[PDB]
From a paper:
Dedicated assembly factors orchestrate the stepwise production of many molecular machines, including the 28-subunit proteasome core particle (CP) that mediates protein degradation. The CP is composed of four stacked α-rings and β-rings, each containing seven distinct α or β subunits. Unlike conventional proteases, the proteasome harbors three different types of active site (β1 or caspase-like, β2 or trypsin-like and β5 or chymotrypsin-like), each present twice. Previous work identified five CP chaperones: proteasome maturation protein (POMP, also called hUmp1)29–34 and proteasome assembly chaperones 1–4 (PAC1–PAC4).
Key differences between structures 1 and 2 set the stage for the β4 incorporation seen in structure 3. One side of β4 binds a composite surface from β3 and the β2 propeptide, while its other side binds the α4 region that was bound to PAC4 in structure 1. Structures 3 and 4 are analogous to recent structures of yeast 13S and pre-15S intermediates, respectively. In structures 3–5, β2’s residues 225–237 face the α-ring and cling to the adjacent α2 subunit.
Author numbering:
A (entry chain D): 1 to 123, 133 to 241
B (entry chain J): 1 to 167, 177 to 235, 243 to 264
C (entry chain G): 2 to 243
D (entry chain E): 1 to 239
E (entry chain A): 4 to 233
F (entry chain F): 5 to 244
G (entry chain C): 2 to 238
H (entry chain H): 44 to 141
The structure:
């Protein structure tokens, strides 16, 4: 009857006595150090909102590093290690371009989603440290997807990722309904980000984009954001 | 410090001290269990510190249905006044930066209560052996210069072999607090003897069964060899639970 | 893959302070795991190999228990050590002999086969993935211009040619007996060589043999093909000896 | 205490002749929701329970589509389930293209087991941590199969896997003598009743946390969920 | 002690211990000597098979590489065999390319380059042998030595194997530059006899010589005649 | 063998490989299977435990069918046994394709044994954890019976037993004059031995699996008819 | 623990070896970069100027192309490989597309190359950080920074190496729209920023200046001394 | 391509290995080619970095080319190559990263 | 220590202990010296293979010729030095074939240092324990002198030393070196003085020192190794000058 030491969390291919992958769990915990992102899917579009978290006034805020365009109808969002998403973004772009060139029609979001998932499930010898929020519209309609460092995608309707995700998810649960409007979705995203963020809300601390069946992928500019902020 | 189980501390007027060291394979702890179980010692107090990880459990030495429900902790003291023997058992592992204060406190208690000598059972790593040691006996001993001459003469008669020195300093890899205890005893003029064995981790019951006989060659607390030791009731499931079905 | 193990005697590619390879030395003690002893003696115009047969269970089919093998139509073998390792090495020797014949147009000699096997065995002691085989090989044959041949190779990759050798548990006693006999005389007929081998085994093991406890294989200048003796012939030799 | 040295790799035997990593992997099946599968003389039914979670943030799929006559349910890791489903789909497609005919379920399961056995022996890999229930229909009648992380498969009349499936298994064993002589509706009712036993007393089955898969004589594999399960749930008793 | 097991690990003082242990393995082999005379080189060694049960024309420790090159070793025989084969192949390749017999120095450099590779990669083990190489080029003799680490030196006379420090001490005071071949053979046999630990016979030592006519291994009759002469 | 028993490419100081020993010890974690050859053929018997009432009758069979004339009985880890059965089927098919006639049992046993032994030399793999027996009958060769163990060793047998209680089973087998009996007389003895060996305290309930290959099936391996199995079970139960 | 392998996650989501690779950067010489209105200025501290040393071979400012230059801090041998790879990639991209390369493009290439070496246990990351500065085709000055982990950002003024904290604190309050009016003012600002952590006068300063439609120019010690004297006179006044 | 012998000369060791493996599998069984391939891989996994010339001693011993000279050994010495790439690029190419 | 088992691990403070140990291994080798003058470059080394039974072949034991314009000297492990020198010769010949013009010295040094650096980044390899000194002439910068480290670092010097007592030799050279007004004779005298004060021998002898010189004559570069007579004359001149200086006190 003695107490001894045992370790099961130093390998990516090791099972604990209760059947857990502690390296993957730690990789998932690693995305709690990133900035907060919010994505809401409506009947006429998807809105993606992130915060920039400018550490120093000398840093140039005009840089775009959190929202990326995959194609004319697909957006993206990121949280965690931004340097880890470059390969996934490149593969998604290559796959969608090749499919469009070959078939002469745009692929659905699910196809590029599965193509991305087929690359993340190769542990590079370690799991990724980033979380994605794919958004877009297709013949079926607007739809939203979420990914974890585990390498698998799921479909959702209102998801928040980042450090302050629990309160944002609680607010999204106590707000929101099935038949709503894109403008009020954008507004509610602004309010929720305003409570979540520690500092005040300006035209440069955040950036958001949207995709709708009418136009192509569109990213809001400073002039457009100011009217929405003033609308609050 | 020593906290008595009752109201007054017993008179340990220079009996002996038998203690283990938390080393590779837990050989010292297993040997201590064997000795305590065989001699049928009785608990007399506690050694309460803040250097070991806490743990609790029921009585590890149970023979009847009335003594099997006694709570135990990670540091306890057993005594046999007839033979003038005292035993200490450690059932846990040390916290970081907490070994030297523990050794200092233990040696201060040993000096304060008043004991003839201290005997430590330990072990060392087996893969750090040179060519000459690979073909020799795996048992070694060590004595403080303050030790009595009669003990030295007896050990010389026993034809034992002493631990080798390295450039000169004493090094015992995988020995835990053995080197610290030896150095402090040398610096504080305390009679202490150390016995160890080269082992590897795995099933280490035979190593303890050999170490107890090695000690008995000198102390002779039992009839000389020409079973003898009582296995405690807590040595039941040393590999885990049972076999799941639908596999073999 | 796994990685090497720390210690002076726990990996194959680690030297000791005296420059010894304890993992190679431990493979020489696996030869004694079986508990049998082999004896090979070379005569004036013949070569003989004698080994020990032990069938403890009565439910075994004794026809399937053997340690004498046929590598080529003119080369015989006897193996001492681990059974599966011995069989695998026999298969490898057959493959190497076939390759030699295909490449060079004539049959391989005994010394060349032993050298090739030893060369293969040497590689296993320098790489951190393979392990040596716990067995030793003894080969006999007839050379068209030199006569009978007796060769032996070790798990370390060392081979040599002898006039009489032994392997197994009682190798040292067999070696001393053979040294005395060879010092006394070395020119023997066919009947004297087999009697010498049988007497060596009997004297060393302190046992009286039955025709079902030993195996005998011979080659001869007159009949170069490898042959395995039968129980009747073994009993005839034992009766003549006694 | 003596197991610490023999339970870190899958290619190491213990002094007791056991491999502990395989058992640890088998322990990962019981971290998913319960699933129940059963078959009749003409039909095979799969019933799954969706995790108690807000539907806004996740829409998990526990029943998947492999072919026109094969469907599976999963419990355990998700990446392994996706890999296995891709392998089965590719095998079925290749079989059809080469020799156009339905692929036998027994041969598919044999291929799955042969594929799964290898990582339990090679170094540098780990066993799959997912358990599958397979319902199919070929020219032998309906079939129900179960797969294990230990590369073993079984032929079952009715099986339940997942977390706290002992009660479901007990119910299935108690009511197993009246499954062949039933129609689709009664079989689905029996499956739902069996699945209901893995819940506390107060809760009940609603049209928000149940999925159904059916295959039979001339009916291809179909998945019912959301409001498609109301006709099956509208005839149940209280408890 | 933590740096004594790995081959690709430097000690804090900047030392490689496994190469030292390979050299220790070399230092525990059978003795061998080599003396460069005014018109030839002589190599001598002590046999391992000191028994009557040994076939004389089966395995030899003194081997030829080309008509004018031969070598002897001290250490592990299995490691020596493969190096001998590689040296023979390299000499044949050089002759094929340049239509001229290879000089001794080039062969020594190539063999040392082959030996050096096994001391810088993980998962392998250094060779446990040291070689003595003799040759005759451009009307003058040569004598080289090669360590397990891949370093080579040129000697006038040297000894290696068991008890080689005292052998070198003997050679230092018993060596003369303007020395003939027969006296060189006598000196080599005496140096070998210094630490034989037994009684020498023409059947437990091997001798080879190199001169204008080329490398050649001596027969037991000549060895017996020399032993009787001294 | 502490400190020398983590890889299959390591020797102990006394010259032993302990990973192979642990693999061979793993075979005793499963039930017992026996096989006896007689004047006419070979008969197999397995003590199969009951796991649950929800399984079908023909699930988890431990008596395989390698080819038209070869039958197999396994014990130990089941996935390894299935892999080895697939290997044996591949070998038999290859030999039949190449040479044009049925492979002898000795050559098949040698091939499978060498394949098993190939896994005990490297540190990138682990030894197999199962044992099995092969049996066949031919007019020009007679009955044959072999065993292969995780070490990679094969032998011919007159009576064999593998599994948990492989010692009491051998003791019971050693009391039969099996060289003068027929298959119909050996089926009952096999059932009786299986019933005697089984322990009903640690275990709960077991079934009986039986098969033979011999003259009465024209050298074809198949399951015992139900009536004969029932009669043998009745005789075995009455013997107790 | 959790820091003896490159690809092991801490229980709270940290890769400690990649963080240790930045302690090497935090021990190099200070480098400062400032983006002006129509000029870009670089500056590197010179440390341990040996008497018998040749200064031509120990320069820490390099020219990647006709309009891109870079400065680094960290291990000296690791920077050479990255510089050569970037130099080759610039010409490769010029072959691919006729137009001259972009500062952001070359920064992304360098970042991807640095990130490639943090994926396996068989190789170690690059212990350097860089300040990439240059001009675009239209004529807009740019400034970027790269980390050993593979992340990059856009700045208006930054510092790396030891003393970066104090230099950045000085720059945050001394960088306005008036101090960047002229090239002389920008150079004076860079020298003032360097002088906070550099002792022994202005003899330990290396400066580089790039203008529109011109090549990289390295200022002379006499010019540096003249600027230092002007700054001292203005401060005294 | 340019010559009938170019493709044949480029792929000779592969074809010889395939023929030996097929013959060995047909004669003995599945185990022998498996063991041969594992030994080949094990002895080939250790060597110098790709921008320096190796010797391949153990691989040559295993294959049996330690007593044979061909035209690949006397023509166009690979050790004295006239062109060589950058070290890091060669190492990355060998790993498949490029 | 838990951060010094391989070359692919960083310490918490950002250090490479294996590379540091490899650099420490250089201190056991012999002394090598190099001096730059107005009309030539110098290289002086210390002989370590001194023994009565050693033979004298080749032209030198520590100085090698790389091409018609360059030469080098090594200190460290001879087996690695051989590989490095062979690679240097191959690189020089490759550049000559490519461009029909001799390779510049800095280009050659950088080419070798890239190889030396590549062995400290990929695991499973042991870095080279060798340091080198290079001398040469080219049309771009004239006479030059470089140094290299086991880690892959190089630099250009006017006078430097590697090996035993390197710090003392560097201090003496720094104290007593004049910049811009040095000739070959003064450089040789300074080298003799530094070697005498560096080597732990009471009396310097000409059989344990080797000197090489590089210079330009009639549009050609001349590399020669000095003779024992010249070395003895230099040593005698230094000794008599020291005696004169001591006496004039």
């Amino acid at each position: 009857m003695f107490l001894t030491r045992s370790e099961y969390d130093r390998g990516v291919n090791t099972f604990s006595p209760e059947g857990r992958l502690f390296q993957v769990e730690y990789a998932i915990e690693a995305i709690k150090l990133g900035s907060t992102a919010i994505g809401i899917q409506t009947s006429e579009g998807v809105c993606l909102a992130v915060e920039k978290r400018i550490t120093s006034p000398l840093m140039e805020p005009s840089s775009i590093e959190k929202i990326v365009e995959i194609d004319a109808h697909i957006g993206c969002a990121m949280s965690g290690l931004i340097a880890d998403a470059k390969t996934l973004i490149d593969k998604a772009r290559v796959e969608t371009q090749n499919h469009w060139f070959t078939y002469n029609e745009t692929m659905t979001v699910e196809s590029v989603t599965q193509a991305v998932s087929n690359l993340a499930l190769q542990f590079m010898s370690r799991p990724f440290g980033v979380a994605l929020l794919f958004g877009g519209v297709d013949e079926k309609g607007p739809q939203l997807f979420h990914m974890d460092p585990s390498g698998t995608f799921v479909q959702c309707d209102a998801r928040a990722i980042g450090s302050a995700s629990e309160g944002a998810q609680s607010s999204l649960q106590e707000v929101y309904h099935k038949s709503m409007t894109l403008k009020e979705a954008i507004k509610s995203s602004l309010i929720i980000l305003k409570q979540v963020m520690e500092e005040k809300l300006n035209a440069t601390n955040i950036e958001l984009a949207t995709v709708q069946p009418g136009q192509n992928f569109h990213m809001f500019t400073k002039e457009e954001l100011e009217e929405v902020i003033k609308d609050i | 410090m020593f906290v008595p189980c009752g109201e007054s501390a017993p008179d340990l007027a220079g009996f002996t001290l038998l203690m283990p060291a938390v080393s590779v394979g837990n050989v010292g702890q297993l040997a201590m269990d064997l000795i305590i179980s065989t001699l049928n010692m009785s608990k007399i107090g506690y050694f309460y510190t803040d250097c070991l990880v806490p743990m609790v459990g029921n009585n590890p030495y149970a023979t009847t249905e009335g003594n099997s429900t006694e709570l135990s902790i990670n540091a306890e003291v057993y005594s046999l006044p007839s033979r003038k023997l005292v035993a200490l058992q450690l059932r846990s592992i040390f916290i970081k930066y907490k070994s030297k204060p523990f050794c200092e406190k233990l040696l201060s208690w040993v000096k304060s209560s008043g004991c003839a000598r201290v005997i430590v059972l330990s072990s060392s790593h087996s893969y750090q052996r040179n060519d000459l040691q690979l073909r020799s006996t795996p048992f070694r001993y060590l004595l403080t210069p303050s030790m009595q001459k009669s003990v030295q003469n007896k050990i010389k008669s026993l034809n034992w072999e002493e631990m080798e020195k390295s450039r000169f300093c004493i090094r015992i890899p995988g020995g835990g607090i053995t080197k610290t205890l030896y150095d402090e005893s040398c610096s504080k003029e305390i009679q202490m003897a150390v016995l160890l064995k080269f082992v590897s981790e795995g099933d280490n019951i035979p190593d303890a069964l050999g170490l107890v006989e090695y000690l008995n060659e000198w102390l002779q607390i039992l009839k000389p060899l020409s079973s003898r030791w009582k296995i405690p009731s807590s040595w039941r499931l040393l590999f885990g639970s049972g076999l799941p079905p639908a596999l073999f | 893959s796994r990685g090497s193990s720390a210690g002076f005697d726990r990996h194959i590619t680690i030297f000791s302070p005296e420059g010894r390879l304890y993992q190679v030395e431990y493979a020489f003690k696996a030869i004694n795991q079986g508990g049998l002893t082999s004896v090979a003696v070379r005569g004036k115009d013949c070569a003989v190999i004698v080994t020990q047969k032990k069938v403890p269970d009565k439910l075994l089919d004794s026809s399937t228990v053997t340690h004498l093998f046929k590598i080529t139509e003119n080369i015989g073998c006897v193996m001492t050590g681990m059974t599966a390792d011995s069989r695998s090495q026999v298969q490898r020797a057959r493959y190497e002999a076939a390759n030699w014949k295909y490449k060079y147009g004539y049959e391989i000699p005994v010394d060349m086969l032993c050298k090739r096997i030893a060369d293969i065995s040497q590689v296993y002691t320098q790489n951190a993935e393979m392990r040596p085989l716990g067995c030793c090989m003894i080969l006999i044959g007839i050379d068209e211009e030199q006569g009978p041949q007796v060769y032996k190779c070790d798990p370390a990759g060392y081979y040599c040619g002898f006039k009489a050798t032994a392997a197994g548990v009682k190798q040292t006693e067999s070696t001393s007996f053979l040294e005395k006999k060879v010092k006394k005389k070395f020119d023997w007929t066919f009947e004297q060589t087999v009697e010498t081998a049988i007497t060596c085994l009997s004297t060393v093991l302190s046992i009286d043999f039955k025709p079902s406890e030993i195996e005998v294989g011979v080659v001869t200048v007159e009949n170069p093909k490898f042959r395995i003796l039968t129980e009747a012939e073994i009993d005839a030799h034992l009766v003549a000896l006694a | 205490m003596f197991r610490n040295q023999y339970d870190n790799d899958v290619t190491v035997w213990s002094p007791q002749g056991r491999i502990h990593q395989i058992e640890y992997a088998m322990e990962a099946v019981k971290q998913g929701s319960a699933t129940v599968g059963l078959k009749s003389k003409t039909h095979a039914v799969l019933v799954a329970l969706k995790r108690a979670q807000s539907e806004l943030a996740a829409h998990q799929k526990k029943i998947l589509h492999v072919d026109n006559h094969i469907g599976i349910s999963i419990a355990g890791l998700t990446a392994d389930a996706r890999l296995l489903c891709n392998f089965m789909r590719q095998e079925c497609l290749d079989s059809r293209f080469v020799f156009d005919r339905p692929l036998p379920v027994s041969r598919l399961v044999s291929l799955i087991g042969s594929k799964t056995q290898i990582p339990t022996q090679r170094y540098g890999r780990r066993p799959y941590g997912v358990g599958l229930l397979i319902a199919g229909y070929d020219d032998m009648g309906p079939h129900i199969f179960q797969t294990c992380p230990s590369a073993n498969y079984f032929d079952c009349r009715a099986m339940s896997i997942g977390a706290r499936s002992q009660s479901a298994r007990t119910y299935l064993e108690r009511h197993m003598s009246e499954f062949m002589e039933c129609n689709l509706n009664e079989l689905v009712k029996h499956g739902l009743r069996a699945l209901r036993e893995t819940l506390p007393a107060e809760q009940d089955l609603t049209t928000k946390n149940v999925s159904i898969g059916i295959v039979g004589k001339d009916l291809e594999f179909t998945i019912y969920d959301d409001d498609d399960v109301s006709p099956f749930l509208e005839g149940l008793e209280e408890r | 002690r933590g740096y004594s097991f790995s081959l690709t690990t430097f000690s804090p003082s900047g030392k490689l211990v496994q190469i030292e242990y390979a050299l220790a393995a070399v230092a525990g082999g059978a003795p061998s000597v080599g003396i460069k005379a005014a018109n030839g080189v002589v190599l001598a060694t002590e046999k391992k098979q000191k028994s009557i049960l040994y076939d004389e024309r089966s395995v030899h420790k003194v081997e030829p590489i080309t008509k004018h090159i031969g070598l002897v070793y001290s250490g592990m025989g299995p490691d020596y065999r493969v190096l001998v084969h590689r040296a023979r192949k390299l000499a044949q390749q050089y002759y094929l390319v340049y239509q001229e017999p290879i000089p001794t120095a080039q062969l020594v450099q190539r063999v040392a380059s082959v030996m050096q590779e096994y001391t810088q990669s993980g998962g392998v083990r250094p060779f446990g042998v040291s070689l003595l190489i003799c040759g005759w080029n451009e009307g003058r003799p040569y004598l080289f030595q090669s360590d397990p680490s891949g370093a080579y030196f040129a000697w006038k006379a040297t000894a290696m194997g068991k008890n080689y420090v005292n052998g070198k001490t003997f050679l230092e005071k018993r060596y003369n530059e303007d020395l003939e071949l027969e006296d060189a053979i006598h000196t080599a046999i005496l140096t070998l006899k210094e630490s034989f630990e037994g009684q020498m016979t023409e059947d437990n030592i091997e001798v080879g010589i190199c001169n204008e006519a080329g490398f050649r291994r001596l027969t037991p009759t000549e060895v017996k005649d020399y032993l009787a002469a001294i | 063998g502490t400190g020398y028993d983590l890889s299959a490419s390591t020797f102990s100081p006394d010259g032993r490989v302990f990973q192979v020993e642990y693999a061979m010890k793993a075979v005793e974690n499963s039930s017992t299977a026996i096989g006896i050859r007689c004047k006419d053929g070979v008969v197999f018997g397995v003590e199969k435990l009951v796991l649950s009432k929800l399984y079908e009758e023909g699930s988890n069979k431990r008596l395989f069918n390698v080819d038209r004339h070869v039958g197999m009985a396994v014990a130990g880890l089941l996935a390894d046994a299935r892999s080895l059965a697939d290997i044996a089927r591949e070998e038999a098919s290859n030999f039949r394709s190449n040479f044009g006639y049925n492979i002898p049992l000795k050559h098949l046993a040698d091939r499978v044994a060498m394949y098993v032994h190939a896994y005990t030399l490297y540190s990138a793999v682990r030894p197999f954890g199962c044992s099995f027996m092969l049996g066949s009958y031919s007019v020009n060769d007679g009955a044959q019976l072999y065993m292969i163990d995780p070490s990679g060793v094969s032998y011919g047998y007159w009576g064999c037993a593998i599994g948990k209680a492989r010692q009491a089973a051998k003791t019971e087998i050693e009391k039969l004059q099996m060289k003068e009996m027929t298959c119909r007389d050996i089926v009952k003895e096999v059932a009786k031995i299986i019933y005697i060996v089984h322990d009903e305290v640690k275990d709960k309930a077991f079934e009986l699996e039986l098969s033979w290959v011999g003259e009465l099936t024209n050298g074809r391996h198949e399951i015992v008819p139900k009536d004969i199995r029932e009669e043998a079970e009745k005789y075995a139960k009455e013997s107790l | 623990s959790y820091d003896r392998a490159i690809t092991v996650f801490s229980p709270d989501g940290h890769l400690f070896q990649v963080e240790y690779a930045q302690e090497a950067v935090k021990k190099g010489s200070t480098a400062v970069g400032v983006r002006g209105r129509d000029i870009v200025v670089l500056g590197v501290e010179k440390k341990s100027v040996a008497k018998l040393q040749d200064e031509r071979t120990v320069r820490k400012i390099c020219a990647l192309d006709d309009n891109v230059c870079m400065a680094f801090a960290g291990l000296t041998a690791d920077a050479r490989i990255v510089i050569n790879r970037a130099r080759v990639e610039c010409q490769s991209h010029r072959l691919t597309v006729e137009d001259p390369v972009t500062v952001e493009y070359i920064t992304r290439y360098i970042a991807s190359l640095k990130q490639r070496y943090t994926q396996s246990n068989g190789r170690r990351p690059f212990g350097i950080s860089a300040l990439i500065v240059g001009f675009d085709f239209d004529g807009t000055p740019r400034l970027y920074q790269t980390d050993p982990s593979g992340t990059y950002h856009a700045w208006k003024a930054n510092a790396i190496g030891r003393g970066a904290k104090s230099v950045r604190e000085f720059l945050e309050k001394n960088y306005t729209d008036e101090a960047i009016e002229t090239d002389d003012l920008t150079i004076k600002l860079v020298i003032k920023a360097l002088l906070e952590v550099v002792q022994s006068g202005g003899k330990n300063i290396e400066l580089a200046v790039m203008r529109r439609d011109q090549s990289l120019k390295i200022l002379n010690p006499e010019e540096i001394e003249k600027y230092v004297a002007e700054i001292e006179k203005e401060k005294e006044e | 391509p340019s010559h009938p012998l170019e493709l044949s000369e480029k792929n000779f060791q592969l074809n010889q290995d395939k023929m030996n493996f097929s013959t060995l599998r047909n004669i003995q069984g599945l185990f022998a080619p498996l063991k041969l391939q594992m030994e080949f891989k094990a002895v080939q996994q250790v060597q110098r970095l790709p921008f320096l010339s190796s010797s391949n001693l153990s691989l040559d011993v295993l294959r049996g080319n330690d007593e044979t000279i061909g035209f690949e050994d006397i023509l166009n010495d690979p050790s004295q190559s006239e062109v060589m790439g950058e070290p890091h690029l060669m190492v990355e190419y060998k790993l498949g990263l490029l | 220590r838990r951060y010094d088992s391989r070359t692919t691990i960083f310490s918490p403070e950002g250090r490479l202990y294996q590379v540091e140990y490899a650099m420490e291994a250089i201190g056991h080798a012999g002394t090598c010296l190099g001096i730059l003058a107005n009309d030539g470059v110098l290289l002086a080394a210390e002989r370590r293979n001194i023994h009565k039974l050693l033979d004298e072949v080749f032209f030198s034991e520590k100085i090698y010729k790389l091409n018609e314009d360059m030469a080098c000297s090594v200190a460290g492990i001879t087996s690695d030095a051989n590989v490095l020198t062979n690679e240097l010769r191959l690189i020089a010949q490759r550049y000559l074939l490519q461009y029909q013009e001799p390779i510049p010295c800095e280009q050659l040094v950088t080419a070798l240092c890239d190889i030396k650096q590549a062995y400290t980044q990929f695991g499973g390899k042991r870095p080279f324990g060798v340091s080198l000194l290079y001398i040469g002439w080219d049309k771009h910068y004239g006479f030059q002198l470089y140094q290299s480290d086991p880690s892959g670092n190089y630099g250009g010097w006017k006078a430097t030393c590697i090996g035993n007592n390197s710090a003392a030799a560097v201090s003496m050279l720094k104290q007593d070196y004049k910049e811009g007004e040095m000739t070959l004779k003064s450089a040789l005298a300074l080298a003799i003085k530094v070697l005498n004060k560096t080597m732990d021998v009471s009396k310097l002898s000409a059989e344990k020192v080797e000197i090489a010189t590089l210079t330009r004559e009639n549009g050609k570069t001349v590399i020669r190794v000095l003779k024992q007579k010249e070395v003895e004359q230099l040593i005698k001149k230094h000794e008599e000058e020291e005696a004169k200086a001591e006496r004039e006190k």
